[PDB]
Design a protein around this ligand. Structure first.
Ligand SMILES: Nc1ncnc2c1ncn2[C@@H]1O[C@H](COS(=O)(=O)NC(=O)CCCC[C@@H]2SC[C@@H]3NC(=O)N[C@@H]32)[C@@H](O)[C@@H]1F
Length: 266
């Protein structure tokens, strides 16, 4: 609404650079753009033209042609979200492990905003693959895309974004009770958490998988999983495997899902 605009000051690119680029940090470049079609598309394009995008950060105040998984979209209004993409060199890591990079990103986003909530409402955590949920609503969405030797990780985090503006199943920090969320502080914490999780992923650190399981809303829940191609499978999510795939219990039979949309059931 018009009133939420007063809760949406611009990002401070100068300050973010000061905090996030320098000794002790792996981020090599940070830019804030007023507007773009898709931050993911932009970093993919840079890589396609020969740019080294490892440790490169692109943040957009507004995104007009946002991309979701499986060809879906991502909606946004100006300054209502933290909208960013980062580049990650992955060629040094076995391809079977790349799926965990996306899971690590969701964990980073969750950890960056979790303390901002006074009372953690029911169902606050990670829905497989890496939706960030709070009170059943989708607080953030992550998209990982390949451009050898890189992966581009994209984060869309609803800070003051109203559900009526983007999606009926959406939520935001503001709609979770955070009266005056500071995107500058949140973006800084997010990128610091993200660096740590990427390093963990790159070194196959056991704590990454352990920390993910600890925050998983999906593991242990009855789910309907919509597979690519339109088929549904119903069962109980039991675990995540070493490729980041979802292990389903279907009446005693194990079904491993590499990609799909999860609906938590009663
Ligand atoms: N702002 C929003 N908040 C919550 N849910 C939203 C939303 N905008 C759209 N949605 C809903 O979520 C669906 C898409 O969800 S999804 O298939 O799991 N995909 C994702 O969650 C990944 C989204 C990644 C968006 C980031 S923002 C910066 C980066 N660049 C880019 O183009 N994409 C990534 C849409 O079909 C539906 F509209």
């Amino acid at each position: 609404v018009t009133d939420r605009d007063r809760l949406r000051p611009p990002l401070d690119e100068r300050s973010l650079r000061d905090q996030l680029i320098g000794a002790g940090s792996g981020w090599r470049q940070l830019d804030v753009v007023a507007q773009t079609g898709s931050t993911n598309a932009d970093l993919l394009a840079r890589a396609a033209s020969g740019a080294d995008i490892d440790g490169v950060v692109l943040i957009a105040e507004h995104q007009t042609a946002g991309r979701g998984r499986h060809g879906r979209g991502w909606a946004a209004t100006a300054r209502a979200q933290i909208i960013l993409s980062v580049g990650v060199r992955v060629v040094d890591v076995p391809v079977q492990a790349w799926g965990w990079l996306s899971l690590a990103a969701g964990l980073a986003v969750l950890d960056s905003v979790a303390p901002l909530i006074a009372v953690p409402p029911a169902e606050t955590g990670l829905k497989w693959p890496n939706d960030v949920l709070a009170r059943g609503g989708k607080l953030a969405g992550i998209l990982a895309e390949v451009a050898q030797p890189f992966v581009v990780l994209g984060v869309g985090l609803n800070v003051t974004q109203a559900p009526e503006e983007v999606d009926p199943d959406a939520t935001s920090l503001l709609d979770l009770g955070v009266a005056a969320p500071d995107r500058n502080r949140i973006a800084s914490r997010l990128l610091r958490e993200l660096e740590a999780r990427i390093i963990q992923w790159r070194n196959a650190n056991p704590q990454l998988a352990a920390d993910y399981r600890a925050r998983s809303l999906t593991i242990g829940s009855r789910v309907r999983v919509e597979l690519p191609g339109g088929q549904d499978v119903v069962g109980i999510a039991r675990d995540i495997d070493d490729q980041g795939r979802l292990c389903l219990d279907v009446g005693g039979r194990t079904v491993v899902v590499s990609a799909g949309d999860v609906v938590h059931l009663r």
